[PDB]
Amino acid sequence: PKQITDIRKFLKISRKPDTTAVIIMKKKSKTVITKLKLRTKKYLYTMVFADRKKAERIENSLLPSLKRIYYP
Amino acid sequence: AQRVHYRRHNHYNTKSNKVRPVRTPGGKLTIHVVKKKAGKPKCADCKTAIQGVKALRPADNYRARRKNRTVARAYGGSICARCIRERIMRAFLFEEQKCVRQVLKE
Amino acid sequence: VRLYKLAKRKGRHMGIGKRKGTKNARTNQKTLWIKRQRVLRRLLKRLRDSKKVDRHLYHSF
């Protein structure tokens, strides 16, 4: 499992066709934190956002053939 | 205390079967087998450890990226810098001496 | 046990009669020496760094 910090890199990864599923998790922080996981054939890449709206926007951006798993 | 047991087949306290007791998310204390500490790769002359080489076991050395095995000198990851220097000096100076000897003869 | 430990902290149960290990077993002479030397040497190092003591003096001390 890997972490991602460059949003652009994440986007690129998403664009790449072996990325079957996205996992999008909501977490009550000690505000609503959001973890964006992409499930690639090789690795499970995750991005952490402090900011909900940004997270939402990025989710929206994600290709609509991704197999989105809303965990909690 | 939480007690433990070997899980991998080898149930004796050998150098290969050394063990690091580790806490799980479950709360169970488990035993994890430590991969042995490898020997630092050494100089073809003085048998001192060569720098810039990850000391890895022969299994793990095969996988590691070529930068982690090599150093970019001449004799590289087989001879330390000091020794290399000395070798170079020998190669030059002795050659020079030979020439001098020849001159003397003639 | 906690009460006992508190009492020991105030020095209470420690005492000739309540003592079965040799002096070294109770608290190792070697460990005490180590402590002391480390304390002293550290202090010396500090002093020399501050320049409050000169090299020569430090070394002899």
């Binding site: - | 000395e86 000096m89 020998r90 100076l93 002795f94 020079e96 001496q97 | -």
Partner: protein
């Protein structure tokens, strides 16, 4: 007798004169051209000795193979550490240059 003379000369240099001992300093001196004469102990490890010789040749400096050990070369000078090679960069009253 020769050895004694050499020792005396060394002493003289120490008293009045500019020197510096040990490989690196000596080499530096040679590179500069500041070295007038280098004196090298019997026990100086072969390669380094050779290097020193080469440097001297390049600078047309004298090479003097000191008869005695590392230890002696040091005792010959005022010093309680073993020496190996030293470079006189100015002779005072002393003759050793000639």
């Amino acid at each position: 007798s020769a050895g004694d003379n050499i020792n005396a000369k060394l002493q003289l240099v120490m008293k009045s004169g500019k020197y510096q001992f040990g490989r690196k300093s000596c080499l530096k001196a040679l590179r500069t051209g500041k070295g007038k004469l280098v004196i090298v102990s019997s026990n100086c490890p072969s390669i380094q000795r050779s290097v020193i010789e080469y440097y001297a040749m390049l600078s047309k400096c004298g090479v003097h193979d000191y008869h005695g050990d590392n230890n002696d070369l040091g005792t010959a000078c005022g010093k309680l550490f073993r020496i190996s090679c030293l470079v006189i960069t100015d002779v005072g009253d002393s003759d050793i240059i000639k």
